[PDB]
Amino acid sequence: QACSRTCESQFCTIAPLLRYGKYCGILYSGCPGERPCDALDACCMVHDHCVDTHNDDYLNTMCNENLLSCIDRVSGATFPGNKCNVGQTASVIRGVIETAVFAGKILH
Ligand SMILES: [Ca+2]
Protein backbone atom coordinates (compact mmCIF):
# COMPACT_ATOMS: atom_id res chain seq x y z
CA GLN A 1 0.00 0.00 0.00
CA ALA A 2 2.84 2.37 0.90
CA CYS A 3 4.10 2.38 -2.66
CA SER A 4 3.77 3.98 -6.05
CA ARG A 5 1.70 2.93 -9.06
CA THR A 6 2.24 6.26 -10.88
CA CYS A 7 5.18 7.68 -12.82
CA GLU A 8 6.21 10.79 -10.91
CA SER A 9 8.46 13.70 -11.90
CA GLN A 10 9.07 15.84 -8.85
CA PHE A 11 12.00 17.87 -7.46
CA CYS A 12 14.03 16.77 -10.47
CA THR A 13 17.26 18.53 -9.38
CA ILE A 14 16.91 18.14 -5.59
CA ALA A 15 18.31 14.75 -4.60
CA PRO A 16 16.75 14.48 -1.12
CA LEU A 17 13.26 15.24 -2.57
CA LEU A 18 13.57 13.71 -6.06
CA ARG A 19 10.76 11.37 -7.11
CA TYR A 20 11.01 10.08 -10.64
CA GLY A 21 9.02 7.28 -12.22
CA LYS A 22 7.67 4.67 -9.82
CA TYR A 23 11.11 3.73 -8.39
CA CYS A 24 13.65 6.59 -8.41
CA GLY A 25 13.77 8.43 -5.14
CA ILE A 26 14.74 8.01 -1.51
CA LEU A 27 12.35 5.65 0.36
CA TYR A 28 10.08 5.76 -2.67
CA SER A 29 9.36 2.58 -4.58
CA GLY A 30 6.88 0.96 -6.94
CA CYS A 31 4.28 -1.52 -5.73
CA PRO A 32 4.92 -5.22 -6.36
CA GLY A 33 4.73 -6.11 -10.06
CA GLU A 34 4.65 -2.49 -11.22
CA ARG A 35 6.28 -1.89 -14.60
CA PRO A 36 8.99 0.80 -14.50
CA CYS A 37 8.30 4.00 -16.44
CA ASP A 38 11.46 4.24 -18.58
CA ALA A 39 15.08 3.01 -18.72
CA LEU A 40 16.18 5.22 -15.81
CA ASP A 41 13.20 4.02 -13.75
CA ALA A 42 14.12 0.39 -14.49
CA CYS A 43 17.65 0.96 -13.15
CA CYS A 44 16.07 2.26 -9.92
CA MET A 45 13.71 -0.74 -9.67
CA VAL A 46 16.59 -3.20 -9.81
CA HIS A 47 18.54 -1.12 -7.27
CA ASP A 48 15.55 -0.96 -4.91
CA HIS A 49 15.03 -4.73 -4.92
CA CYS A 50 18.79 -5.31 -4.62
CA VAL A 51 18.88 -3.30 -1.38
CA ASP A 52 15.73 -5.08 -0.18
CA THR A 53 17.25 -8.52 -0.76
CA HIS A 54 20.51 -7.51 0.92
CA ASN A 55 19.21 -6.84 4.43
CA ASP A 56 18.29 -3.20 3.56
CA ASP A 57 21.96 -2.31 2.97
CA TYR A 58 21.80 0.80 0.79
CA LEU A 59 25.61 0.82 0.99
CA ASN A 60 25.93 -2.60 -0.72
CA THR A 61 28.66 -2.26 -3.38
CA MET A 62 27.01 -4.61 -5.90
CA CYS A 63 23.64 -2.85 -5.69
CA ASN A 64 25.26 0.56 -5.95
CA GLU A 65 27.85 -0.12 -8.65
CA ASN A 66 25.25 -2.00 -10.74
CA LEU A 67 23.04 1.11 -10.65
CA LEU A 68 25.97 3.28 -11.80
CA SER A 69 26.57 0.90 -14.75
CA CYS A 70 22.85 0.99 -15.52
CA ILE A 71 22.55 4.82 -15.27
CA ASP A 72 25.46 5.35 -17.70
CA ARG A 73 23.62 3.31 -20.33
CA VAL A 74 20.17 4.92 -20.03
CA SER A 75 18.51 5.85 -23.32
CA GLY A 76 15.26 5.81 -25.29
CA ALA A 77 11.87 7.42 -24.82
CA THR A 78 10.54 8.55 -21.45
CA PHE A 79 7.06 8.46 -19.91
CA PRO A 80 4.36 11.05 -20.77
CA GLY A 81 4.14 14.13 -18.55
CA ASN A 82 7.76 13.90 -17.39
CA LYS A 83 8.78 17.31 -16.05
CA CYS A 84 12.38 16.16 -15.56
CA ASN A 85 15.29 16.16 -17.98
CA VAL A 86 16.20 12.46 -18.07
CA GLY A 87 19.97 13.04 -18.45
CA GLN A 88 20.11 15.76 -15.81
CA THR A 89 18.17 13.54 -13.36
CA ALA A 90 20.35 10.49 -13.97
CA SER A 91 23.31 12.75 -13.13
CA VAL A 92 21.58 13.87 -9.91
CA ILE A 93 20.98 10.20 -9.03
CA ARG A 94 24.57 9.25 -9.95
CA GLY A 95 25.97 11.81 -7.49
CA VAL A 96 23.93 10.28 -4.65
CA ILE A 97 25.10 6.75 -5.52
CA GLU A 98 28.75 7.88 -5.81
CA THR A 99 28.34 9.25 -2.26
CA ALA A 100 26.84 5.92 -1.08
CA VAL A 101 29.70 3.97 -2.69
CA PHE A 102 32.20 6.23 -0.91
CA ALA A 103 30.30 5.92 2.41
CA GLY A 104 30.38 2.10 2.07
CA LYS A 105 34.16 1.98 1.58
CA ILE A 106 34.62 4.28 4.60
CA LEU A 107 32.55 1.96 6.82
CA HIS A 108 33.67 -1.45 5.47
CA1 LIG B 1 13.43 4.25 -4.59
In the chain, the domains with their CATH numbers are 1-108 (1.20.90.10)
25 in a known ligand binding site: yes
Helix, strand, or coil (residue 39): helix
Question: For residues 108 and 76, what is the distance between their CA atoms, to the nearest angstrom?
Answer: 37
How far does residue 72's CA lie from ligand 1's centre (Å)? 18
Question: For residues 86 and 97, what is the distance between their CA atoms, to the nearest angstrom?
Answer: 16
Q: Which residues are catalytic?
A: 47
Residue 15's alpha-carbon distances to 1, 33, 77, 106, in angstroms, are: 24, 25, 22, 21
Question: For residues 64 and 98, what is the distance between their CA atoms, to the nearest angstrom?
Answer: 8
How far does residue 27's CA lie from ligand 1's centre (Å)? 5
Beta strand pairing call for 8-10 and 19-21: antiparallel
Instruction: Give CA angle at 5 (36, 64), nearest 5°.
Output: 45
What experiment produced this structure? X-ray
23 in a known ligand binding site: yes
